Design an enzyme around this catalytic site. Structure first.
Site, PDB file in Angstrom:
ATOM      1  N   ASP A   1      -5.506   3.230  13.512  1.00 54.32           N
ATOM      2  CA  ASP A   1      -4.603   3.718  12.477  1.00 54.32           C
ATOM      3  C   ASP A   1      -4.921   5.176  12.175  1.00 54.32           C
ATOM      4  OD1 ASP A   1      -6.992   3.530  10.927  1.00 54.32           O
ATOM      5  OD2 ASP A   1      -5.817   3.118   9.116  1.00 54.32           O
TER       6      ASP A   1
ATOM      7  N   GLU B   1     -12.746   5.033  -0.578  1.00 55.74           N
ATOM      8  CA  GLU B   1     -12.689   5.547   0.780  1.00 55.74           C
ATOM      9  C   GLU B   1     -12.642   7.067   0.804  1.00 55.74           C
ATOM     10  OE1 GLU B   1      -7.802   4.794   1.411  1.00 55.74           O
ATOM     11  OE2 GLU B   1      -9.247   4.214   2.949  1.00 55.74           O
TER      12      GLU B   1
ATOM     13  N   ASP C   1     -11.604   5.665   6.531  1.00 57.89           N
ATOM     14  CA  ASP C   1     -11.279   6.913   5.851  1.00 57.89           C
ATOM     15  C   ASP C   1     -12.512   7.516   5.207  1.00 57.89           C
ATOM     16  OD1 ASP C   1      -7.957   5.922   5.118  1.00 57.89           O
ATOM     17  OD2 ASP C   1      -8.462   7.885   5.965  1.00 57.89           O
TER      18      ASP C   1
ATOM     19  N   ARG D   1       0.869  -1.162   0.000  1.00 58.78           N
ATOM     20  CA  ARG D   1       0.000   0.000   0.000  1.00 58.78           C
ATOM     21  C   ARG D   1       0.910   1.216   0.000  1.00 58.78           C
ATOM     22  NH1 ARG D   1      -5.194   1.575   3.782  1.00 58.78           N
ATOM     23  NH2 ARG D   1      -3.788   1.116   5.530  1.00 58.78           N
TER      24      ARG D   1
HETATM   25  C1  BVS Z   1      -4.868  -2.020  11.857  1.00 58.86           C
HETATM   26  C2  BVS Z   1      -5.435  -1.272  10.704  1.00 58.86           C
HETATM   27  C3  BVS Z   1      -4.809  -1.324   9.437  1.00 58.86           C
HETATM   28  C4  BVS Z   1      -5.358  -0.636   8.346  1.00 58.86           C
HETATM   29  C5  BVS Z   1      -6.542   0.123   8.506  1.00 58.86           C
HETATM   30  C6  BVS Z   1      -7.120   0.892   7.372  1.00 58.86           C
HETATM   31  O1  BVS Z   1      -6.269   1.210   6.333  1.00 58.86           O
HETATM   32  C7  BVS Z   1      -8.410   0.928   7.012  1.00 58.86           C
HETATM   33  C8  BVS Z   1      -8.846   1.532   5.744  1.00 58.86           C
HETATM   34  O2  BVS Z   1      -8.069   1.773   4.803  1.00 58.86           O
HETATM   35  C9  BVS Z   1     -10.103   2.376   5.812  1.00 58.86           C
HETATM   36  O3  BVS Z   1     -11.146   1.797   6.484  1.00 58.86           O
HETATM   37  O4  BVS Z   1     -10.065   3.611   5.852  1.00 58.86           O
HETATM   38  C10 BVS Z   1      -7.155   0.175   9.785  1.00 58.86           C
HETATM   39  C11 BVS Z   1      -6.611  -0.512  10.875  1.00 58.86           C
HETATM   40 MG    MG Z   2      -7.901   4.105   4.633  1.00 58.79          MG
END
Ligand code: BVS
Ligand code: MG
Ligand code: NI
Length: 712
Positions: free
Chosen positions: A621, A422, A450, A328
């Site tokens: 995160d 997102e 996001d 990523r």
């Molecule tokens: C532990 C962890 C790793 C990655 C993400 C995350 O990147 C989610 C998405 O990209 C989004 O839901 O925005 C959340 C928690």
């Molecule tokens: Mg994200």
């Protein structure tokens, strides 16, 4: 301050040397050309990276003005977004044309694990999580309740192990049914005629569908393990009656191993603090060891090799021992001093990542230079690109990947793209975004964390938002999730590409995960994100119960999401909330920012388990930070709460975050105004409204740099 000039570029020497001495050897790329090409890609696509970044702020500025001028005319709203070029026309139906894609993506439905590339041990475990012991998963988690003498002890509890074994036999019964009787009754297994046969305490039965018998190890007459397949995922029964667990077991089963983390995203974005060239190199180095195949640790833990089986009839075949790896990159916003230009202007991080993670990924297409392990057995390089706003940012990424493949000597469309759905402008234009990547797209995923942040920031000026816990049930997010699956299936994704859903964040509530995360396969997602190898194997249960491909057939053509439901702003009602509820929401968000930020700023750790005010460990995160910070900013800008309300909550939560930590940790309390991380948290809220699209990176990066700088 010590840089290497190539063209307009000033490369930090730590980066230059790593590329030249570690990444480039074995790629056939001469370092002279690569850097000359890097300089050339930077200089020319920086303009359009900057145009696109400018389009975001001016679209947002026009929306902010519209809401402030203004009880909300939704037909006029959607027309205005159409008039400013935010909503664009839907293209007409098409099939994606992406070719040369690994089978774990095209055909296989299963968990997808996400891990910070900066933590080599975690990355090691994630790659090795393609196979995961169901027993250790069940024993180690609350899936089996610690009740009636089944509590986890310092030593193995045989009552617990029995409920473990029983649970797993139930699973095998539901995934690979016997023609008659249950696996709970099994006393042994043999392979006859190419067909698996299991010994029962009376008769001898076979598989309901013998095609689910996929192989075995050891002698036909008593396998050391039988290999089973169900919905494209493999189940392994380890048979050893001499093992301690096997001695107690009716059939000498030692373990049930699930194919778990089918793919893994190694993350340079929201789960890492990669603020400078030194930080970026540590990550690139791990990415290099993973692509070489020789990443290792002491405390010697290696990447797993492939697993060999005797085919049911004759044969000796081989299954991937490790999770197919994505990377990523960061999005298009952030800038990194790892490369500055002549005039001090930092170079765009997303461009750099494409070239460097691209270059490094060359090693993972061969196996002795390049190292011994292969990632993609199809020559593809898998880059999930996050935080793209709209189809023109997708097109720019495809052009960017085009140019990188030029500099790198790769065929075109070698660098596949996992699109994160997102941002709101991608959601309402998702079909155009897939089209803009029709030959590179390899998944879409709803980054629902996001996306909630983008939702709050886009309509920041519309009025107060609902509390964060409420967002999960808002019309916009339910249409968003269904729309993403629809557009993907309308684009041909079924059997060509992954439709993926977002991350389970409660790393300690696996029982709940096993109960509720099934909704994601049942809604037709071919993958969903798990924070952990353990979670991968537990979430693998769900792909055995739900026939994801069969669900996606039944969803074909159905358009379950209107543009109006996608545009429904999550505004709060009239009287809204009691001061009761307000304070709970402030304290909760402030402690989730503080708990995450302090580790980001003081230790450069981008992903932390942070207990909220209900003592639920949340894997946090940047995206979860973005929600919490944007929601308080929104509550602030509409007078639900006061700036001093936010500071009081921060002051009262800091010591409790301090006592949630210890180590190498630096207490925030009591010297609040002279803790850098504390001011970073406060600024993330008090300046939340001003950040571009509410992103937290600008404030996080500069505060991390400043913490590093006061380590003079
Ligand atoms: C532990 C962890 C790793 C990655 C993400 C995350 O990147 C989610 C998405 O990209 C989004 O839901 O925005 C959340 C928690
Ligand atoms: Mg994200
Ligand atoms: Ni089935």
């Amino acid at each position: 301050t010590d840089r290497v000039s190539v063209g307009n570029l000033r490369i930090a020497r730590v980066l230059y040397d790593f590329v030249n001495n570690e990444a480039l050897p074995g790629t056939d790329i001469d370092p002279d050309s690569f850097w000359a090409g890097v300089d050339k890609v930077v200089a020319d696509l920086t303009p359009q990276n900057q145009a696109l970044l400018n389009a975001r702020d001016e679209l947002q500025a026009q929306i902010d003005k519209w809401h402030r001028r203004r009880p909300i005319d939704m037909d006029a709203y959607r027309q205005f977004l159409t008039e400013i070029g935010y909503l664009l026309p839907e293209p007409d139906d098409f099939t994606i044309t992406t070719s040369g894609v690994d089978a774990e993506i095209t055909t296989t439905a299963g968990p997808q694990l996400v891990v910070p590339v900066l933590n080599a041990r975690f990355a090691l475990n994630a790659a090795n999580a393609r196979w995961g012991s169901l027993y250790d998963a069940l024993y180690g988690t609350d899936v089996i309740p610690e009740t009636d003498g089944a509590e986890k002890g310092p030593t193995y509890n045989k009552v617990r192990g029995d409920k473990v074994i029983a649970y797993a036999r139930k699973f095998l019964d539901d995934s690979v049914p016997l023609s008659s009787g249950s696996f709970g009754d099994a006393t042994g297994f043999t392979v006859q005629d190419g067909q698996l046969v299991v010994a029962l305490p009376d008769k001898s039965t076979g598989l309901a569908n013998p095609g689910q018998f996929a192989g075995y190890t050891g002698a036909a007459e008593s396998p050391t393990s039988v290999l089973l397949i169900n919905h494209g995922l493999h189940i392994e029964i380890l048979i050893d009656p001499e093992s301690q667990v096997g001695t107690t077991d009716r059939a000498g089963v030692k373990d049930v191993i699930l194919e778990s983390a089918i793919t893994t995203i190694m993350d340079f974005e929201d789960s890492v603090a990669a603020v400078d060239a030194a930080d970026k190199v540590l990550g690139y180095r791990n990415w290099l060891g993973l692509n070489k195949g020789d990443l290792a640790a002491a405390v010697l833990r290696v990447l797993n090799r492939d697993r060999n089986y005797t085919a049911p009839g004759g044969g000796q075949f081989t299954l991937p021992g490790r999770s197919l790896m994505f990377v990523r990159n960061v999005g298009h916003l952030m800038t990194n001093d790892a490369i500055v230009d002549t005039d001090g202007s930092e170079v765009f991080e997303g461009i750099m990542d494409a070239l460097f993670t691209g270059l490094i990924a060359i090693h993972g297409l061969k196996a002795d230079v390049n190292g011994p392990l292969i990632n993609s057995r199809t020559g593809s390089i898998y880059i999930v690109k996050p935080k793209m706003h709209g189809p023109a940012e997708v097109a720019f990424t495809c052009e960017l990947f085009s140019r990188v493949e030029d500099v790198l000597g790769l065929p075109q469309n070698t660098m596949k793209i996992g699109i994160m759905d997102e941002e709101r402008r991608t959601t309402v234009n998702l079909k155009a975004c897939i089209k803009a990547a029709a030959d590179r797209v390899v998944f879409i995923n709803t980054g629902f964390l996001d996306r909630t942040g983008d939702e709050i920031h886009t309509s920041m000026e519309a009025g107060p938002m609902v509390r964060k816990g409420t967002m999960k049930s808002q019309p916009w997010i339910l249409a968003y999730e269904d729309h993403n699956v629809d557009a993907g299936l309308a684009a041909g994704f079924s059997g060509r590409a992954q439709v993926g859903k977002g991350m389970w964040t409660m790393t300690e509530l696996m029982a709940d995960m096993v109960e509720t995360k099934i909704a994601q396969p049942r809604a037709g997602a071919s993958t969903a994100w798990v924070p952990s190898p353990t979670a991968a194997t537990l979430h693998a249960l769900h792909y055995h119960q739900v026939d994801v491909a069969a669900v996606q057939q039944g969803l074909a053509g159905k358009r379950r999401a209107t543009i109006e439901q996608l545009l429904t702003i999550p505004l709060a009602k009239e009287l809204a909330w009691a001061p009761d509820e307000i304070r709970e929401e402030v304290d909760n968000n402030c402690q989730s920012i503080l708990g995450y930020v302090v580790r980001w700023v003081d230790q450069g750790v981008g992903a932390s388990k942070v207990p909220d005010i209900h003592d639920v460990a949340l894997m946090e995160d940047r995206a979860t930070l973005r929600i919490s910070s944007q929601l308080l900013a929104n509550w602030l800008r509409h007078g639900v709460i006061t700036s001093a309300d936010v500071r009081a909550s921060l002051e009262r939560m800091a010591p409790l975050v301090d006592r949630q930590n210890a180590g190498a940790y630096r207490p925030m309390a009591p010297n609040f105004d002279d803790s850098i991380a504390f001011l970073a948290a406060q600024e993330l809220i008090l300046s939340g409204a001003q950040q571009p699209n509410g992103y937290t990176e600008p404030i996080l990066h500069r505060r991390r740099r400043e913490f590093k700088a006061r380590a003079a």
